[PDB]
Design an enzyme around this catalytic site. Structure first.
Site, short mmCIF file in Angstrom:
data_model
loop_
_atom_site.label_atom_id
_atom_site.label_comp_id
_atom_site.label_asym_id
_atom_site.label_seq_id
_atom_site.Cartn_x
_atom_site.Cartn_y
_atom_site.Cartn_z
N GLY A 17 4.72 -1.04 3.40
CA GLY A 17 3.78 0.65 3.11
C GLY A 17 4.69 1.93 2.35
O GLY A 17 5.88 2.55 3.78
N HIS B 58 0.52 -1.09 -0.09
CA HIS B 58 0.11 -0.40 -0.02
C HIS B 58 0.74 0.88 -0.12
O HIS B 58 1.78 1.46 1.24
CB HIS B 58 -0.99 -0.09 1.57
CG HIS B 58 -0.34 0.63 2.26
ND1 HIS B 58 -0.02 1.51 2.93
CD2 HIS B 58 -0.22 -1.20 3.06
CE1 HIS B 58 0.57 0.86 4.61
NE2 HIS B 58 0.61 -0.45 4.53
N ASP B 59 0.39 1.98 -0.94
CA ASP B 59 0.98 3.73 -0.75
C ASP B 59 2.16 3.56 -1.05
O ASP B 59 2.72 4.91 -1.38
CB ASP B 59 0.97 3.84 0.59
CG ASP B 59 -0.89 4.37 0.99
OD1 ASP B 59 -2.03 4.65 0.10
OD2 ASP B 59 -1.09 3.58 1.64
#
Lengths: 264, 264, 264
Positions: free
Chosen positions: B145, B127-128
């Site tokens: 992340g 994620h991200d």
């Protein structure tokens, strides 16, 4: 069962063999295979492309992602097809490519996973392991045969735990580590081979441990690792400390189970 | 779209949900799943057994191999199903078992991958993350992340990059490493935790950097790592050097983004 | 062939392309893909969700588990689709997510695997590798391009072997290691980069080596690593020792093949 509940969904492309038990509001996604000795609990979802086989019981509200293999033949060189078992509890998030293998007769016949665990991408649970509740196995973490991972423990990414080792409750093992001996509860372990790095204080704080319990745990840690005394000498001192601080009993319970010596 | 181009091929066994956009001469192979908020660009191929879902845009001429999962629910403990996003550019080779997960609301809502990248077997993009152009993530490389991997950077096999870290342009991270802080552009990093090992000179030479640019970059490296001065002291000296050698500006741009301190 | 034997089973959901050869009592499971230049030997099983393609020959009585990819396009940056090859022998256990990639023209055009091997979850065999017989690659072990792994050798979990390296017969490489040079036969290697840790004595004992052969091998090991002499100086001393103890010839044969220098 051996039946599929009327409120369960089975995708037309899934292959659920006669004899499988599937509970209410469960969901078997496209291209899944489920063997005849599998039991899947109420609300459990297999996203797509999941293989579940063996004598395998899976609890409620689990989410199992694509390319995971659960109940599969283990990698023990002696295994020869014996009808051994896997048990998995409730509310687990079992991510892509996770493997959980069945037990061995010699090892006790059961691989067990509790509830509320997060098993990240490509995590591996070998024959005869016992994972407790609220644990996290990060990406590519690997448990060899007969490993125990107790409640709340975290195993960092790319970390291997060697066969028969016990990882105590609330342990944090850092990433890129190799754990070759037993890890007492509440401890931070890191390295290859991993060595102890104090108490998992931040973890205990977040989980609601009292000031007094954290101090007591730190004192048991110091007895083991700082005092210079033998483990045989400190065992009664720890039991004595646990007469006042119940959380310290976790050490005594752990020592009874430990077989590989302690990381030092 | 929400339409499948007349010159796109969708295998009869693939499941492409209504609303998905599929461009000219794209190819969706056997047993693929494509969700309704997915866009697949002209010439993109999903070999077989690929899952693509979420609000996910994929560019042109990509090749995505079996057992890869793109756009999937991320592993952040706070994520709760929010309609976050993945963007992937053009001409990427995304190999078997690669995972690219969607963003988090808290993290900015987007996981982004540029163009001309090679993501080797079981590479992981959390994620991200933001991966730039012409990068290579080797077998089992893992980005946690919110990690940035800038243009031309290479992450060696079995290497983990910790959350929020920035890997600068033209960096080479060796295999079996753990990167816990930010890596300036043009640097070689190795170890666990990874430490700097000079400038990626061979990389710069092959990529057409001039004698003068390589010397200047080496001089900025020496200012950071050899001079004994604080980063605060060297920042103006590096900006001064960049007045003559434009390639050195990459350091200044990097310092502005860096949040974790530098590997040392 | 190009034919499917009347006693072979092909699941209705499998896609076996015209031209593929499938031998007696072989079993192609659900959702498998088999390309037209593939040959599968008598008794071989593809469990489910297996992709086999390229010019790939597979022997008898192999078991290939879900999500494995065999014969696939390799990860070499120069490869451009040339009809290179994979050969796999008999009685191999190829576990979930294993990848075995085809050769390169520049590298000799063949990736080869012998017989009676165990390739554990997510093991990787790169372009142009040669794995012998009775080897074990543990979870997430990775062989880079052009690597040789000789008979009986074991590669520990999460271990990477660098391109062109030779791992000698009866070698044991510990887990979480990175092997950057050649490993002589009969040696234990561990670390990153891996260094020698004596003879694999337990392995030789279990495999039926005589007291005299184990002593002789230990003496060749001491010549290389303890004597203080150059490899050039010890080569004739080892050949001399092999005049009495035939097992020591394995060193001489290895030296002839070695190109990367020895782990030290």
């Amino acid at each position: 069962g051996s039946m599929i509940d009327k409120s369960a969904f089975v995708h037309p492309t899934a292959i659920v063999e006669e004899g499988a038990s599937i509970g209410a509001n469960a969901h078997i996604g496209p291209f899944c295979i489920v063997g005849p000795h599998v039991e899947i609990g109420e609300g459990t979802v297999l996203k797509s492309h999941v293989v579940v086989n063996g004598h395998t019981k899976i609890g409620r509200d689990n989410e199992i992602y694509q390319f995971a293999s659960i109940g599969e033949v283990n990698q023990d060189l002696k295994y020869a097809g014996e009808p051994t078992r896997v048990e998995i509890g409730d509310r687990n998030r079992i991510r892509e490519s996770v493997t959980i293998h069945r037990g061995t007769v010699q090892g006790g016949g059961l691989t067990k996973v509790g509830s509320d665990n997060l098993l990240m991408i490509n995590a591996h649970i070998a024959h005869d392991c016992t994972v407790g509740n609220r644990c996290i196995l990060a990406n590519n973490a690997t448990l060899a045969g007969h490993v125990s991972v107790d409640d709340f423990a975290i195993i960092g990414g790319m970390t291997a735990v060697h066969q028969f080792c016990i990882i105590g409750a609330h342990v944090m093992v850092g990433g890129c580590s190799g754990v070759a001996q037993d890890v007492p509860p509440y401890v931070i372990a890191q390295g290859n081979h991993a060595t102890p790095f104090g108490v998992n204080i931040e973890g205990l704080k977040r989980r609601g441990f009292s000031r007094e319990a954290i101090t007591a745990i730190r004192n048991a840690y110091k007895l083991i690792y700082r005092s210079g005394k033998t483990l045989d000498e400190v065992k009664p001192e720890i039991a004595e400390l646990a007469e006042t601080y119940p959380e310290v009993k976790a050490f005594t319970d752990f020592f009874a189970r430990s077989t590989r010596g302690l990381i030092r």
